Design a protein around this ligand. Sequence first.
Ligand SMILES: *[C@@H]1O[C@H](CO)[C@@H](O[C@@H]2O[C@H](CO)[C@@H](O)[C@H](O)[C@H]2NC(C)=O)[C@H](O)[C@H]1NC(C)=O
Ligand SMILES: *[C@@H]1O[C@H](CO)[C@@H](O[C@@H]2O[C@H](CO)[C@@H](O)[C@H](O)[C@H]2NC(C)=O)[C@H](O)[C@H]1NC(C)=O
Ligand SMILES: *[C@@H]1O[C@H](CO)[C@@H](O[C@@H]2O[C@H](CO)[C@@H](O)[C@H](O)[C@H]2NC(C)=O)[C@H](O)[C@H]1NC(C)=O
Ligand SMILES: *[C@@H]1O[C@H](CO)[C@@H](O[C@@H]2O[C@H](CO)[C@@H](O)[C@H](O)[C@H]2NC(C)=O)[C@H](O)[C@H]1NC(C)=O
Ligand SMILES: *[C@@H]1O[C@H](CO)[C@@H](O[C@@H]2O[C@H](CO)[C@@H](O)[C@H](O)[C@H]2NC(C)=O)[C@H](O)[C@H]1NC(C)=O
Ligand SMILES: *[C@@H]1O[C@H](CO)[C@@H](O[C@@H]2O[C@H](CO)[C@@H](O)[C@H](O)[C@H]2NC(C)=O)[C@H](O)[C@H]1NC(C)=O
Ligand SMILES: *[C@@H]1O[C@H](CO)[C@@H](O[C@@H]2O[C@H](CO)[C@@H](O)[C@H](O)[C@H]2NC(C)=O)[C@H](O)[C@H]1NC(C)=O
Ligand SMILES: *[C@@H]1O[C@H](CO)[C@@H](O)[C@H](O)[C@H]1NC(C)=O
Ligand SMILES: *[C@@H]1O[C@H](CO)[C@@H](O)[C@H](O)[C@H]1NC(C)=O
Ligand SMILES: *[C@@H]1O[C@H](CO)[C@@H](O)[C@H](O)[C@H]1NC(C)=O
Ligand SMILES: *[C@@H]1O[C@H](CO)[C@@H](O)[C@H](O)[C@H]1NC(C)=O
Ligand SMILES: *[C@@H]1O[C@H](CO)[C@@H](O)[C@H](O)[C@H]1NC(C)=O
Ligand SMILES: *[C@@H]1O[C@H](CO)[C@@H](O)[C@H](O)[C@H]1NC(C)=O
Ligand SMILES: *[C@@H]1O[C@H](CO)[C@@H](O)[C@H](O)[C@H]1NC(C)=O
Ligand SMILES: *[C@@H]1O[C@H](CO)[C@@H](O)[C@H](O)[C@H]1NC(C)=O
Ligand SMILES: *[C@@H]1O[C@H](CO)[C@@H](O)[C@H](O)[C@H]1NC(C)=O
Ligand SMILES: *[C@@H]1O[C@H](CO)[C@@H](O)[C@H](O)[C@H]1NC(C)=O
Ligand SMILES: *[C@@H]1O[C@H](CO)[C@@H](O)[C@H](O)[C@H]1NC(C)=O
Ligand SMILES: *[C@@H]1O[C@H](CO)[C@@H](O)[C@H](O)[C@H]1NC(C)=O
Ligand SMILES: *[C@@H]1O[C@H](CO)[C@@H](O)[C@H](O)[C@H]1NC(C)=O
Lengths: 384, 420, 198, 49, 211
Amino acid sequence: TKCTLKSFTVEKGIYQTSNFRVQPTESIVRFPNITNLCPFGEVFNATRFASVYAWNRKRISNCVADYSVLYNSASFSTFKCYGVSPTKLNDLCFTNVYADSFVIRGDEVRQIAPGQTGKIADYNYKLPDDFTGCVIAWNSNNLDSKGNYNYLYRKPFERDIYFPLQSYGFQPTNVGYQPYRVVVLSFELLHAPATVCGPKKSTNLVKNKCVNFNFNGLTGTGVLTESNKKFLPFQQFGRDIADTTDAVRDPQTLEILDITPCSFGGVSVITPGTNTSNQVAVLYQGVNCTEVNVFQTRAGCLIGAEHVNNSYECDIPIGAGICASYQTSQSIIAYTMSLGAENSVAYSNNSIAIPTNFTISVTTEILPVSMTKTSVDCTMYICG
Amino acid sequence: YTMSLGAENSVAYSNNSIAIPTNFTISVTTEILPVSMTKTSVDCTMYICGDSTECSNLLLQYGSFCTQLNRALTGIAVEQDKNTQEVFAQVKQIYKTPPIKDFGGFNFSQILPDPSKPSKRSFIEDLLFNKVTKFNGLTVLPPLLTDEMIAQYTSALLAGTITSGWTFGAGAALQIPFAMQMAYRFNGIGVTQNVLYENQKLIANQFNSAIGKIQDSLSSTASALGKLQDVVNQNAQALNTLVKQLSSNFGAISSVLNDILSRLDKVEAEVQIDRLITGRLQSLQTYVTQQLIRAAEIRASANLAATKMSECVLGQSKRVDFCGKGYHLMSFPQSAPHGVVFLHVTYVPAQEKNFTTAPAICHDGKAHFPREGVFVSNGTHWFVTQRNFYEPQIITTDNTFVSGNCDVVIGIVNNTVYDP
Amino acid sequence: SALGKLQDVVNQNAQALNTLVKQLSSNFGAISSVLNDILSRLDKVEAEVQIDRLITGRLQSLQTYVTQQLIRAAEIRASANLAATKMSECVLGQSKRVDFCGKGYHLMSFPQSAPHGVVFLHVTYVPAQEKNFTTAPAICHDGKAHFPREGVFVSNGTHWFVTQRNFYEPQIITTDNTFVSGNCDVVIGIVNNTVYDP
Amino acid sequence: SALGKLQDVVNQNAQALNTLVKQLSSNFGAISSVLNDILSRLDKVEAEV
Amino acid sequence: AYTNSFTRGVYYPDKVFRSSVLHSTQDLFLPFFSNVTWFHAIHDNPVLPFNDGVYFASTEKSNIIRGWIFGTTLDSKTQSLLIVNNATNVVIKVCEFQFCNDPFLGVNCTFEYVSFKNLREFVFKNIDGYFKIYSKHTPINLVRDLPQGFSALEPLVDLPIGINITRFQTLLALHAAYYVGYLQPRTFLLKYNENGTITDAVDCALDPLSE
Ligand SMILES: *[C@@H]1O[C@H](CO)[C@@H](O[C@@H]2O[C@H](CO)[C@@H](O)[C@H](O)[C@H]2NC(C)=O)[C@H](O)[C@H]1NC(C)=O
Ligand SMILES: *[C@@H]1O[C@H](CO)[C@@H](O[C@@H]2O[C@H](CO)[C@@H](O)[C@H](O)[C@H]2NC(C)=O)[C@H](O)[C@H]1NC(C)=O
Ligand SMILES: *[C@@H]1O[C@H](CO)[C@@H](O[C@@H]2O[C@H](CO)[C@@H](O)[C@H](O)[C@H]2NC(C)=O)[C@H](O)[C@H]1NC(C)=O
Ligand SMILES: *[C@@H]1O[C@H](CO)[C@@H](O[C@@H]2O[C@H](CO)[C@@H](O)[C@H](O)[C@H]2NC(C)=O)[C@H](O)[C@H]1NC(C)=O
Ligand SMILES: *[C@@H]1O[C@H](CO)[C@@H](O[C@@H]2O[C@H](CO)[C@@H](O)[C@H](O)[C@H]2NC(C)=O)[C@H](O)[C@H]1NC(C)=O
Ligand SMILES: *[C@@H]1O[C@H](CO)[C@@H](O[C@@H]2O[C@H](CO)[C@@H](O)[C@H](O)[C@H]2NC(C)=O)[C@H](O)[C@H]1NC(C)=O
Ligand SMILES: *[C@@H]1O[C@H](CO)[C@@H](O[C@@H]2O[C@H](CO)[C@@H](O)[C@H](O)[C@H]2NC(C)=O)[C@H](O)[C@H]1NC(C)=O
Ligand SMILES: *[C@@H]1O[C@H](CO)[C@@H](O)[C@H](O)[C@H]1NC(C)=O
Ligand SMILES: *[C@@H]1O[C@H](CO)[C@@H](O)[C@H](O)[C@H]1NC(C)=O
Ligand SMILES: *[C@@H]1O[C@H](CO)[C@@H](O)[C@H](O)[C@H]1NC(C)=O
Ligand SMILES: *[C@@H]1O[C@H](CO)[C@@H](O)[C@H](O)[C@H]1NC(C)=O
Ligand SMILES: *[C@@H]1O[C@H](CO)[C@@H](O)[C@H](O)[C@H]1NC(C)=O
Ligand SMILES: *[C@@H]1O[C@H](CO)[C@@H](O)[C@H](O)[C@H]1NC(C)=O
Ligand SMILES: *[C@@H]1O[C@H](CO)[C@@H](O)[C@H](O)[C@H]1NC(C)=O
Ligand SMILES: *[C@@H]1O[C@H](CO)[C@@H](O)[C@H](O)[C@H]1NC(C)=O
Ligand SMILES: *[C@@H]1O[C@H](CO)[C@@H](O)[C@H](O)[C@H]1NC(C)=O
Ligand SMILES: *[C@@H]1O[C@H](CO)[C@@H](O)[C@H](O)[C@H]1NC(C)=O
Ligand SMILES: *[C@@H]1O[C@H](CO)[C@@H](O)[C@H](O)[C@H]1NC(C)=O
Ligand SMILES: *[C@@H]1O[C@H](CO)[C@@H](O)[C@H](O)[C@H]1NC(C)=O
Ligand SMILES: *[C@@H]1O[C@H](CO)[C@@H](O)[C@H](O)[C@H]1NC(C)=O
């Protein structure tokens, strides 16, 4: 409370000091139970690559992918990535991976990015102007050069078949004019079943308890619970209004689980004045006391105060009719507030009360009229 | 179509014509006021950053924005209890009604508490409670007063208003018979109080029947609750917009923060997350600005409702059309979700007759003027009567006062003026 | 603590200014919050990006301050029109408006200045020492019902008096205190007495 | 100037609209405040910045 | 011939569960109450342009409509998609070997793939190198035409064929009726019920009430 106010003195009140959250008990990993190694050695050490006028494409599915072996390979002249970072590729997983495989001149590699245009990139191989994945390339001059005019050049992901047939004199004596093998990995980050995943091992599954979790690369924290939700066979994930994942289909047992965020609330510290006591009582707002002397209010769980059956004027307000005060050998009491002294008016069809005497009150009403006439020289405030 | 502004009416004016109402209708013109919007409060770090430490370490670089948003929302949330306390808690004793309801023919049994309810609302409060209708760091705090405590304050105000009238606004409540309280309220509208007693069963039946029409109106017609349901809907749409805004890209690669933290390493993730922070924070400042301006609108409505409670429930208002469309008699508060409802009881005059009138009357060459009310003639005899209920009286030295010879007055008439 | 309305208006503005001043020290994602560091450390291309984050943040924080101060100025202006209205109705006059001019039946108010505000010493009559009386809406005499001009009828238990509504001052009931209207039989709860003819 | 409050209300709203219209011409750190200058000069990916 | 499409031709826009929500979407869709071109299997399969994309359907109890072709020339002057159903499999090809150039079925495989009382429905669309197919099967008692009532199509397959498509055709089998409607870029509003099934939709460009 003193650090909330930045003050060594705190007046009688109730201060929203902190945000209580039940912590993740353990970390859960849920991945597809499949173990076949992906064909990257076939992709990168292929007999030949395709010509860029009609580039090869291969689909990678139902397999395990350690991208670290690729990212760590100093043989790659570039490893430029988009919408993912090379270090993160193991942590996360995909419905498919596609490898687009072809040879180009090194001077043209600058055209292979999600926004370019050029005599290759507006023609025979256009990346989507928002693509997600990695471009992996290196000079193959030690193998693909001869020159090797078999290598041939010319909508997003358009294949195609005066005529525009053009070829490269790839010779071992060429450095920008060398042949460069390139593989573009496009990652199908849709919400179907995952089929290409990192070597990250699955754990056992935990339920009804607050955990950190991963499902196919959906990292989060929450209480996993079994659910009645009628997921259709093509849907692996389900979402709330906020686009936050609200449910998941488990990748190994295929049952439908809710995700509920772990119990949380404000930590309102009820205090008498520090100029009166050091003693405090804590309202965990909205939580049930089983989740945290102790007392339960409709406003939350109240700890360190003492419940009282008498009723008094509301000294510090807590909520839902509960109030607190510091009182007699002394404690913070908490009580249902008195609205006032109860009074049956002595009515009848023929009774009247008339005041035989009065008093002159002088009250005191204290109204603001003018706040301070501040003015800010906004250029000097911003630019000094 | 070109809208009708209303039925056109040539008021039948002339320098000697007056219309006096010969009968009245008591009418219970319901008014509704918001008093307190939902006490929303936000964990601005869980909203903006979703318990990512990686994001929270960036949100710190924005300084006292997140803390002053909590401060601002708490300033609204604490003043919702100020509003509710200033409207309803205008009484330091909980008055309660007698066991026997001997109120001179008036039947409050629909506006007083019913023991049959689990929280002891009246019947009309229970109609009003029928007609009026996340995990994302957002919360709703409870009101300080429960709706049961609100119903005890409206019962204290109402048991006071019934058994003691205006007097509990000043001192302690003074009991007075309800048939004698209305003879105060009739003097407040300038209607001579015998107009109550000589019509007491009729006035009681018009009040009872008007209360019955409020039960039918509130049972049949949802658009009666228009303001309160709109204040619930405005805050619900404000929260649903604030929640939907978590799905907005703001120019980041995704709006789900854990997509960015799983896909991107920290050097790149810090660029994208700073767009989600900038966007979500702009949307939280937009929400809090909207809620502050809306809370000033509800606070104007709460200070209006507290003024209506003070003048119109705890008293009787001379302020024309402040207390419903009529001459105001008294009002009964009823609670409703997020607001208050006033059953403003008003005298409205009804069955008019035309009369010939004169500003003064000559007797022995000396002009007489009325003490209370106006002069009128049915066509053959001259009478004095009160302004708001035709009650013809013989013109005399007791209902009139002299002021000098006739000749100065435009439109004076001769008559006799009698001396008791 | 009686000054809480005024001291809180001073505190709100002082806390808003301290918040606005502290926001000069916030990074907003720039390498320092002291502008002269950026201009001494970075050359006038790289620095121009960092300064744009400080301008964006400081300007957003100034707009946050001015929005808060406009909403707070409207909150004070409602209080100023309320104070001006109590000055007009309650100082320059007397108010029939129940519980506007403080608790009680209002007599008069004296204004006093205070820093950033005004204080009204509302002087009010409060009735204090009740007696319980038998009462009636009307009184019969010679078949005529009589009603009071000002005040109410009451009895101590043996004699009937008319008295003003707000201070027990019993008076012998007479035709100067009361007005006739019609026969007895229409009135629920009329009582007999004698009404004296002075 | 007897109409000073109404002329002030017209002036405030007109100056608020003229401010909002002039703010179309403010650069905000972009290469032009005329949107069509950006869409004519830059290829339509760099232009997104 | 022509007939009215009514509200038919809506499909699940993405592979994500939602429930009790009015999710808005913008995509290639069959415009509400547009004219569908209509055909009879007996005594009717010309080549049609493909445009933005194609809704297709057939009303059936005999299984005579059995495939589709998509491309620019549809004749192996250049590669073109073939789709066939053979009553044990769905089969898909782009192979160079010559097609039935007056197409009916007698009762370089560089891409190759394998998986009235009824109305069978489809949506076919091409975006950014991927062809996509959606479908629905439903019973009908109204043998006359496409029902004036609602159901939504669900995705079958995504096909990374990379080929340019501007014309299509349909295939019939012999020793039934079929429909065509072109899609357009449209905003749509969708209602997902308490089970996450789409029970209703709005075409946002239909009429001022839908706007
Ligand atoms: C006051 O009004 C209530 C209804 O507003 C009356 O309630 C009725 O009471 C009788 C029995 O005494 C029942 O037969 C009716 O069905 C009740 N009506 C309802 C709607 O509940 C009550 O009797 C009235 N009392 C007086 C003295 O007027
Ligand atoms: C004043 O108006 C009321 C109606 O607002 C009259 O009361 C009605 O009188 C008729 C017979 O004349 C009865 O059938 C109704 O039942 C009465 N209504 C009520 C609510 O009691 C009243 O008689 C009129 N009085 C005068 C003097 O004109
Ligand atoms: C105007 O009012 C007076 C009094 O109500 C009426 O005068 C009475 O008329 C009746 C016959 O209709 C006589 O029996 C009474 O003796 C008259 N009273 C007096 C005091 O003379 C008069 O008739 C009314 N005139 C009109 C046009 O309505
Ligand atoms: C009221 O009555 C008086 C008489 O009591 C009228 O006064 C006479 O008016 C005529 C014409 O102006 C004069 O010739 C007489 O000399 C007046 N007599 C007196 C005694 O003054 C008067 O005109 C009447 N007025 C009205 C408005 O009826
Ligand atoms: C009610 O008030 C009247 C007047 O104050 C009281 O009557 C007087 O009583 C005294 C004796 O106590 C007599 O000397 C007077 O002559 C009485 N006055 C009259 C007008 O008769 C009466 O005693 C009071 N009664 C009660 C019950 O308080
Ligand atoms: C007020 O006094 C009158 C007499 O002055 C009472 O009238 C008598 O009432 C009884 C019962 O109703 C009748 O038998 C008599 O015939 C009435 N007398 C006359 C002259 O009419 C009247 O009851 C008294 N009322 C109260 C409330 O005290
Ligand atoms: C897809 O196919 C269409 C033809 O169906 C191609 O469009 C023609 O392109 C040539 C130039 O190459 C133009 O001269 C023609 O006028 C176009 N015809 C039509 C009907 O548009 C289109 O270029 C092809 N696109 C790709 C990416 O292969
Ligand atoms: C390609 O072959 C070399 C040996 O010739 C091997 O070291 C390398 O790991 C292979 N690449 C991949 C992706 O497996
Ligand atoms: C996945 O593996 C578990 C054992 O780890 C096995 O029980 C389960 O049946 C498997 N699921 C599928 C769909 O093969
Ligand atoms: C605070 O404590 C000091 C003594 O330590 C005392 O003089 C002062 O009056 C106290 N003030 C309050 C508000 O309790
Ligand atoms: C508190 O939680 C327990 C389960 O831990 C439950 O049985 C009890 O009903 C809850 N009470 C309230 C008031 O939420
Ligand atoms: C309060 O009163 C109830 C009975 O009304 C009793 O059971 C309970 O033990 C009391 N609690 C305390 C704290 O005295
Ligand atoms: C009064 O009489 C005039 C006669 O022209 C008539 O126009 C007017 O409507 C009448 N008003 C009432 C209330 O009877
Ligand atoms: C009223 O006005 C008429 C003309 O409109 C005039 O003849 C008549 O004398 C006037 N009477 C009075 C009392 O002014
Ligand atoms: C009036 O008398 C009744 C008699 O029961 C009593 O209950 C009530 O408290 C008295 N009121 C005052 C203000 O003395
Ligand atoms: C007052 O009510 C009682 C019943 O409580 C009744 O006996 C008495 O006659 C009534 N008196 C009047 C004046 O209404
Ligand atoms: C549908 O086709 C008919 C002729 O078959 C034509 O009259 C009508 O305008 C068309 N309507 C639409 C919406 O295409
Ligand atoms: C259907 O097609 C597949 C692939 O061509 C084939 O294996 C299967 O035998 C075919 N079925 C029939 C009935 O010919
Ligand atoms: C297969 O493709 C190559 C070009 O990639 C072409 O030369 C060859 O003729 C094609 N074969 C057939 C059977 O069409
Ligand atoms: C959800 O599906 C069940 C059958 O699995 C059905 O009983 C229920 O009625 C459906 N929900 C709605 C909103 O109809």
